[PDB]
């Protein structure tokens, strides 16, 4: 169980998924979506 929960929703290139993971670098990891150094949570991605 969880204290609070959120679903952050957006679309990217299929290669940029590696950048979403916490502690990365590349424009997606740096200028638009940064996950914190203790990111407790999951990344869910699929070609749409």
């Amino acid at each position: 169980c969880f204290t609070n929960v959120y679903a952050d929703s957006f679309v990217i290139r299929g290669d940029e998924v590696r950048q979403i993971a916490p502690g990365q670098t590349g424009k997606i990891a740096d200028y638009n979506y940064k996950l914190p150094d203790d990111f407790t949570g999951c990344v869910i991605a699929w070609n749409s």
Binding site: P22, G23, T25, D37
Partner: protein, 49 residues
């Protein structure tokens, strides 16, 4: 670890990787003081006697 200097880690690696090097340096430097202080505690038991 990659260096004996803290900034020669940080100015090269990034946050999650410096955290891996620096934990190697902390583990061993903390072990160095637990050793020094243990030596001095045994050596204190001599200078007391």
């Amino acid at each position: 670890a990659i260096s004996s200097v803290l900034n020669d880690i940080l100015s090269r690696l990034d946050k999650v990787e410096a955290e891996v090097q620096i934990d190697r340096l902390i583990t061993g430097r903390l072990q160095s003081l637990q050793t020094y202080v243990t030596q001095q505690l045994i050596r204190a038991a001599e200078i007391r006697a």
